[PDB]
């Protein structure tokens, strides 16, 4: 009559280890088409009903919410890949699962998983020694500041719809990374806002921050749209008398007191209106709506105001003019105010857009893109982010390895030669480790449509002939040197990937039992 569980499912054995691998392959199989710049996109529907389309493995895998406990380990290394590096979260999950997928015949032959895990740790130690040999230290060597940013951005923007107009985007790509501190470069500090309409080549870069122009109300369009040195004020609270929707009730016992309260509400607001007037602020920004009385009073005094400003965008306004937010209109101090070099509201995109420009105190920027469709621009937005991450890791890290499978084929090569020197069970395990390293160049050719049989075999030939830099050309299908084609990734990518993927590999293969408690 007694039970050992009370509804707690726990399963163990060598079959459970294989079952934990198949769960990681299912997660891997989903992330395979997203590997590479030409890779396919995953269509994800969140439980929030919001639908997103992106090829970045970080954003993708965070939206899967995999319940399987062993497959959750692939999520931990994705956040580590997004933290130490920030790019390549797709390859770290594919490489980790491939090591477990190639270890499947080893578990069937009766090979213990401890020797399997130890065999990979020895292969990684031999791989780290090769990464140091493949790490090239280059800064001013055979290059310059601007020429390095231009030649590397043309390849990142290649094989895209922007290929022909890429000459215009590289100019803004170089200006974007130089508009920020070269010691610390953050991709989040470069803003990108999608503007519907207009040609793709007419996109512009703004040194300051921009807004969405939320005004639907009549009475606008009379004001100078170009300010030289305005005093920008950030207001945390609303100023309105009679709003566009709601209202207020006035209950008194006298007839003459009806108009008194109506005039009282006017004097209470008009007070706070002339307080910004006495402050002398030409720009009024508010996260809350600005009523008709305020817009009409500010227009007669030649004061510009913007209501319902986004909170996330106003935080960049503080980082732009170096000002500060103040709750009320009474006690406003001078450090809350700010002044930029230029304020211009243009017609860009067949829609009026107000923006800050030329802010000397700005620690962030905004890059406006144009195009015929918002989804095509979003593909350009993520394409620009890929070029920023290359420059981001080119500055902070001066050690560069050849990407696009070049370094990947070189690490796998020597490990196949190390198998001849290492006798015993480590010979078959390390040889399978290098065989599992072949998935990175493979999937890149399978995603873009290249032939996996011919290109990889032709790549294994000339690469073993004493030229270590041959990668896979993503433009015209053929083998070629990525160091000449300027496809570059820092040495931290190969170090963090082999460390995180093997950590996820050895952690999952060391799990003999899955204990799931219900309640």
């Amino acid at each position: 009559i007694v039970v050992l569980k009370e509804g707690t499912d726990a399963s163990q054995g060598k079959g459970q280890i294989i079952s934990n691998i198949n769960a990681c392959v299912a997660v891997q199989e989903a992330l395979k088409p997203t590997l590479g710049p030409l890779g396919s996109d995953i269509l994800i529907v969140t439980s929030n009903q919001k639908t997103t389309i992106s090829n970045d493995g970080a954003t993708i895998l965070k939206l899967l919410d995999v319940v399987h406990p062993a497959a959750k380990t692939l999520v931990d290394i994705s956040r580590a890949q997004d933290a130490e590096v920030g790019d390549g979260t797709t390859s770290v999950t594919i490489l980790a699962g491939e090591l477990m997928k190639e270890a499947k015949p080893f578990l069937e032959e009766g090979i213990s998983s401890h020797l399997i895990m130890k065999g990979y740790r020895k292969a990684v130690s031999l791989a780290v020694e090769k990464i140091n040999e493949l790490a090239v230290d280059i800064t001013s060597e055979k290059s310059s500041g601007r020429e390095l940013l231009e030649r590397c951005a043309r390849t990142a923007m290649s094989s895209k719809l922007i290929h022909n107009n890429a000459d215009f985007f590289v100019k803004m790509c170089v200006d974007a990374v130089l508009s920020l501190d070269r010691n610390d470069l953050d991709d989040k500090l470069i803003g990108i806002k999608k503007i519907p309409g207009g040609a793709m080549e007419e996109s512009l870069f703004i040194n300051g921050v921009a807004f969405k122009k939320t005004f639907s109300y009549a009475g606008f369009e009379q004001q100078p749209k170009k300010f030289n040195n305005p005093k920008i004020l950030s207001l945390n609270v609303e100023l309105e008398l009679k709003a566009e929707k709601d209202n207020a009730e006035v209950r008194v016992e006298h007839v003459e007191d009806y108009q008194a309260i109506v005039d009282a509400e006017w004097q209470l607001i008009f007070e706070k209106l002339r307080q910004v007037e006495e402050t002398g602020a030409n720009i009024v920004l508010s996260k809350l709506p600005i009523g008709d009385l305020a817009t009409q009073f500010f227009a007669d005094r030649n004061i510009f105001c913007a209501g319902r400003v986004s909170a996330d965008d106003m935080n960049r306004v503080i980082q732009a003019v170096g000002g500060s937010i103040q709750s009320t209109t009474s006690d406003i101090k001078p450090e809350h105010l700010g002044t930029c070099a230029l304020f211009e509201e243009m017609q860009i995109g067949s829609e009026r857009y107000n923006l800050f420009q030329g802010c000397p105190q700005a620690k962030t920027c905004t890059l406006l893109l144009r195009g015929g469709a918002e989804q095509v621009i979003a593909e350009v937005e993520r394409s620009l982010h890929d070029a920023i991450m290359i420059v981001k890791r080119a500055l902070q890290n001066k050690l560069i390895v050849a990407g696009g499978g070049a370094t990947e084929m070189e690490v796998s090569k020597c490990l196949r030669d190390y198998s001849k020197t290492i006798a015993g069970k480590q010979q078959m395990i390390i040889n399978a480790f290098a065989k599992a390293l072949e998935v990175i160049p493979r999937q890149l050719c399978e995603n873009a449509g290249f032939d996996a049989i011919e290109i990889l075999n032709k790549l294994r030939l000339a690469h073993s002939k004493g030229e270590k830099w041959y990668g896979v050309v993503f433009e015209t299908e053929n083998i070629g040197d990525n160091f000449a084609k300027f496809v570059w990734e820092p040495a931290l990518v190969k170090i963090n990937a082999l460390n995180s993927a093997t950590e996820a590999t050895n952690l999952i293969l060391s799990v003999d039992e899955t204990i799931t408690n219900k309640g």
Partner: protein, 528 residues
């Protein structure tokens, strides 16, 4: 979390179901694409039944969980904002590209190779169609308005408009000329107010140079017309949010009078508060009074003796159209009045239409304004609402014509010429795109075959006929008999489509076909 209620599609089953589901959703609007296309009964969530053949309304009425079909809805969404005409055909053209792509997938062609094929096929078809376009606004300008008038008659022939359409096509032409200048060439649909009312006949629909609402004056004895009043400045109109009267509570009143003291006071005050609020009109120097709140009987009598017409309870949006046209403002109280906040206009009058009891009002200008109000009439409700969107589609046609003078004939004549050019150049490429270009040419042939199926013609026989007549003679545009005219060659029948409109149709449809091919995996979760 929440592993349950989660479906996933990847690999083999992904490329199949995505194309088949797109063909099933598009098949509804395929039969509705054309002038003869069949309508659709659409039931609102409240139970109201509507009947329309517009594909943009169909996709908006369709509420579905299919993400592949949502991409088709997003296609008509961007197509309606950019153009607002080919929304029905842009999805059918995209479905033809998806059906030809599925045939190429079964042949072993990679999805990117198909996407790169439709991209190079599009750029090739754009250049070939760009060489065949003609110019209208060139030479005589009256000849432009002649073709512009007959171009609106084509878009209005598929609607109940077609009866009186000769007058309605003039309304679309006179509307775009007023809100646009020859130098600026900017057409803003917000500047043309679309408004209509039931009653009378459709042919009585006119165009006003100013705002026209349907309102009756607060008192019946007030004069129907408002003159400039012997050399005054225009006609001053007042927009205020407060009535002219002693103020009153809007929720509950309940004013307890304890003694005859307050009774004698409020009797004299409120009686004198009547004239004090009426004199505020003469202080501002205004003629027509428009307020958000009503008036008392004495207020209508005092404004009657002073010849001051009043209108009560006008919507907030309607007050904005008056302030823009007459250069007026919305004044919150009566203490903010001035002569610079009053609406300035030439004449205001209440115009009577036949025996109809509406008796609308008109605020005129007598010079070209920056905004107009389209006035529509009809003998039935659904006829009025259909005429409003029919003219709205005509406003989208006249917008692209003045924006780009290059025009191309249509009705199936343009798509076949685009298909003949790609089929010839497909042999010179000799690549994988050779199969993609032939499929792209067959996908362009779907549009004239779809129009032939809706017109009662053989889609295969007409397609070979449209090609044969454009080969033995010349590539010149030759259309389809869908409208039941004498013969083919729309050039003699004056069926014109904008080149910028056809270019955005073949572009967004090609881009969406590629985005679907770029998705090999779909992960759908539950609804929280």
């Amino acid at each position: 979390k929440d592993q349950g209620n989660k479906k996933r599609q990847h690999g083999l089953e992904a490329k199949k179901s995505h194309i088949l589901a797109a063909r099933s959703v598009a098949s509804i609007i395929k039969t509705s694409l054309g002038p003869r296309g069949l309508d659709k009964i659409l039931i609102s969530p409240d139970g109201e039944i509507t009947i329309t053949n517009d594909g943009a309304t169909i996709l908006s009425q369709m509420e579905l969980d299919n993400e592949i079909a949502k991409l088709l809805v997003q296609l008509s969404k961007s197509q309606d904002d950019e153009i607002g005409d080919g929304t029905t055909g842009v999805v059918v053209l995209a479905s033809a590209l998806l059906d030809q792509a599925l045939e190429l997938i079964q042949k072993g062609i990679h999805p990117i190779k198909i996407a790169n094929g439709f991209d190079e096929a599009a750029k090739l078809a754009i250049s070939k169609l760009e060489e065949t376009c003609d110019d209208i606004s060139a030479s005589n300008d009256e000849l432009f308005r002649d073709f512009l008038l007959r171009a609106a008659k084509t878009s209005l022939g598929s609607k109940i408009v077609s009866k009186d359409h000769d007058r309605f096509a003039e309304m679309a032409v006179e509307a775009v000329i007023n809100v646009m200048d020859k130098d600026r060439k900017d057409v803003d649909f917000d500047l043309i107010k679309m408004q209509g009312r039931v009653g009378g006949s459709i042919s009585d629909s006119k165009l006003i140079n100013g705002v026209i609402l349907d309102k009756d004056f607060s008192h019946p004895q007030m004069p129907k017309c408002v003159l400039p009043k012997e050399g005054s400045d225009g006609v001053k109109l007042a927009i205020l949010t407060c009535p002219f009267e002693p103020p009153k509570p809007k929720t509950k009143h309940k004013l307890d009078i304890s003694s005859v003291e307050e009774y004698q006071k409020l009797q004299t005050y409120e009686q004198d508060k009547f004239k004090e609020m009426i004199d505020d009109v003469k202080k501002a120097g205004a003629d027509v009074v428009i307020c958000q709140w009503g008036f008392d009987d004495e207020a209508n009598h005092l404004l009657l003796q002073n010849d001051l017409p009043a209108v009560r309870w006008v919507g907030g949006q309607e007050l904005e159209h008056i302030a823009i046209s007459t250069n007026g403002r919305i004044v919150p109280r009566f203490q903010d009045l001035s002569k610079d906040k009053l609406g300035t206009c030439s004449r205001i009058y209440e115009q009577e239409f036949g025996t109809t009891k509406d008796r609308m009002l008109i605020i005129e200008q007598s010079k070209e304004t920056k905004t107009v109000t389209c006035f529509v009439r009809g003998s039935n409700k659904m006829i009025v609402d259909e005429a409003e969107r029919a003219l709205h589609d005509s406003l989208c046609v006249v917008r692209n014509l003045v924006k780009d003078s290059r025009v191309v004939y249509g009705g199936g004549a343009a798509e076949v010429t685009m298909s003949l050019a790609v089929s010839e150049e497909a042999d010179k490429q000799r690549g994988i795109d050779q199969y993609a270009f032939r499929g792209f040419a067959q996908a362009l042939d779907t549009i004239p075959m779809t129009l032939a199926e809706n017109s009662g013609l053989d889609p295969i026989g007409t397609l070979s006929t449209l090609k044969s007549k454009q080969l033995k003679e010349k590539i010149s545009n030759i259309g389809v008999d869908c409208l039941g005219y004498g013969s083919n060659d729309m050039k003699e029948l004056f069926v014109v489509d904008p080149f910028i409109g056809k270019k955005q149709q073949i572009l967004l449809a090609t881009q969406l076909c590629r985005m679907i091919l770029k998705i090999d995996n779909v992960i759908i979760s539950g609804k929280d």
